[PDB]
Ligand binder design. Structure first.
Ligand SMILES: [Mg+2]
Ligand SMILES: [Mg+2]
Ligand SMILES: [Mg+2]
Ligand SMILES: [Mg+2]
Ligand SMILES: [Mg+2]
Ligand SMILES: [Mg+2]
Ligand SMILES: [Mg+2]
Lengths: 38, 173, 140, 120
RNA sequence: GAUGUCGGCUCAUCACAUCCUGGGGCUGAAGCCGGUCCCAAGGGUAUGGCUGUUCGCCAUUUAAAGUGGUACGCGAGCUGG
RNA sequence: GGAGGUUGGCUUAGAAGCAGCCACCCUUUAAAGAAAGCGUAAUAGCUCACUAGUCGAGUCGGCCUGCGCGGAAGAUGUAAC
């Protein structure tokens, strides 16, 4: 994870999910795009 | 389009013990599957099946789509054998199934002796393969995940249990 | 299996064995360099031998590797068109004396104008699109 | 010896004559050190020529004390005088000949050297 | 028409923005080590030399020698440098 | 299928569509950017740009606007209805 206040996409593969009330970012290409809170 | 409009078209030997609230599919190759539907649904009876909500909310619009894929998975399970192909990668690794016991060699100090639940019966054609047969997706997928989480894979060697998704992480310096 | 064109391979025409023009370039492709020499022997004497020859290869797995019949190469013989060997340090803006259309005649005589073009004039227009490569414009 | 700033002599030939405890090694604050424990000494009074200079931080093991060593019985051996044996950076001794008796309670795997070199 | 001011001793209690131990994500993480960030306050959290000192600088340890609030805790409890 | 030249250049096994500065034109073709892009940073691959089938009703984005959601950690006890 990477706790922020402004999550956003980085590549073409990132989809922004709102899982259990928190705006997550999961990336299926690189693990270094995983962002937690924002 | 929406999956809630496409019908089911069940094959030959299928019983529907529908009490309105609680459906029940019986067939060959295993039987006794049943689900309790959330109440805001219309379920017709024919050679096929069609599902319909009543209150046009943001929820029953999603309830009728979820219950269509759940009924469809009960049809295939009494028609087709569910399976999960898990392979073993690494030296000194093996899997030795003894009936209802799946005992493994993972380079630990004590050997794990994983016990299977009722229903699912697993078989090993090799020392580095697992075949997990069952009747429902959620129960087969749950047992296949808990075997995997003993020794998850590695980006440096791959030395760990892995199923057939060949999109495994790799890095090497 | 390995199905996409623009597979880069520049070894000698008639001799696949000199590697450091590309080095280990077709290991992950599947088929090693030393077996392609029977295919480079099938197309010699016109594809600029001696120098290593680039060719669009179609990788199969049944001991057959066809090369597209481009008689005269337009990747290396258009270094010869301006009159140099080593190209400029940046293409089409850095110059050593650019090539014109009057010196694009000797290469364009043997284009095999159906097997890489439609007519012969568009094969002259192929090297009008192939001399824009190496520090050289196509001006006139 | 058994406390910081405890004057005690050495039982060794190449060493000094007297040393002094400055730190009891082991745990968080070990207040005391019995027979068979590692302490850290400063050299307080050397022989006019041995090997060890005066005023040098060394490391020693404790081999004799007036408080005694107690066994799994009501039977204790109790000397009169405190005594240490210097060590190197690794736990082998410096000297050659050990003076006076030792006890057999000390002998472990790393201390099979000095038990063999002493007249008990 | 009086609320006794700094450091030490004794005895403490809460906070978490965690020093140690517990659970994890990413790494320019081979292994041993680490770096960084989320979760966690249950129990722990050094003896000395020099100075009125807190602070500091040293010597030697240790799993670790945490940061703050409580009249910069505490003189109808002590000392008085 | 995913381009015809083609390793597009000095460069570097590799700089080629994926060192650096850059070329970005022209064409076999129903189709193709000498390339978006990870892939062995790099050679593949697989995509993207593209076109054929397959599928048979909606889909995609931006603007204004009502109420909400993260950003949001402290010391005796819930303790800013
Ligand atoms: Mg949860
Ligand atoms: Mg008064
Ligand atoms: Mg916390
Ligand atoms: Mg005070
Ligand atoms: Mg008094
Ligand atoms: Mg008072
Ligand atoms: Mg918090």
């Amino acid at each position: 994870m990477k706790v922020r206040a402004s999550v956003k996409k980085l590549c073409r593969n990132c989809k922004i999910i709102r899982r259990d009330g928190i705006v997550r970012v999961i990336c299926s290409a690189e693990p270094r795009h995983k962002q937690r809170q924002g | 389009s929406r999956v809630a409009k496409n019908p089911v078209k069940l094959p030959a030997g299928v019983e529907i013990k529908l009490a309105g609230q609680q459906l029940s599919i019986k067939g060959a190759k295993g039987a006794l599957e049943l689900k309790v539907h959330p109440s805001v649904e219309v379920i017709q009876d024919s050679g096929e099946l069609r599902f319909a909500a009543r209150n046009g909310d943001q929820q029953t619009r999603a309830m009728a789509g979820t219950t269509r894929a759940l009924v469809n998975n009960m049809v295939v399970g009494v028609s087709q054998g569910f399976e999960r192909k898990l392979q073993l990668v690494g030296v000194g690794y093996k899997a030795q199934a003894k009936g209802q016991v799946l005992s493994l060699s993972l380079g630990f100090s004590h050997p794990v002796d994983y016990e299977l639940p009722a229903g699912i019966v697993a078989e090993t054609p090799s020392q580095t393969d697992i075949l997990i047969k069952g009747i429902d997706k959620q129960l087969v997928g749950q047992v296949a995940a808990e075997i995997r989480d003993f020794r998850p894979p590695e980006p440096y060697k791959g030395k760990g249990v892995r199923y057939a998704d060949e999109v495994v992480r790799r890095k090497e310096a | 299996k390995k199905i996409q064109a623009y597979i880069k391979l520049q070894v000698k025409a008639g001799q696949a064995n000199p590697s450091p023009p590309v080095g280990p370039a077709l290991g992950q492709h599947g088929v090693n360099i030393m077996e392609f020499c029977k295919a480079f022997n099938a197309k010699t004497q016109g594809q600029e031998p001696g120098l290593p020859t680039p060719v669009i290869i179609t990788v199969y797995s049944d001991r057959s590797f066809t090369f597209e019949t481009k008689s005269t190469p337009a990747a290396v013989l258009l270094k010869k068109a301006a009159g140099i060997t080593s190209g400029s340090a940046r293409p089409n803006s850095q110059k050593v004396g650019t090539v014109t259309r009057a010196q694009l005649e000797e290469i364009a005589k043997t284009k095999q104008a159906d097997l890489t073009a439609a007519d012969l004039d568009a094969a002259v227009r192929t090297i009008a699109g192939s001399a824009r490569s190496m520090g050289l414009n196509v001006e006139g | 010896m058994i406390q910081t700033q405890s004057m005690l002599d050495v039982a060794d030939n190449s060493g000094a004559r007297r040393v002094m405890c400055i730190k009891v090694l082991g745990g968080s604050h070990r207040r005391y050190a019995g027979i068979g424990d590692i302490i850290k000494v400063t050299v307080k009074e050397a022989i006019p020529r041995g090997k060890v200079k005066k005023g040098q931080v060394m490391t020693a093991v404790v081999v004799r004390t007036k408080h005694g060593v107690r066994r799994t019985d009501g039977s204790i051996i109790r000397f009169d005088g405190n005594a240490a044996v210097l060590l190197n950076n690794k736990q082998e001794p410096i000297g050659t000949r050990i003076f006076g008796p030792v006890t057999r309670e000390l002998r472990t795997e790393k201390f099979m050297k000095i038990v063999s070199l002493a007249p008990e």
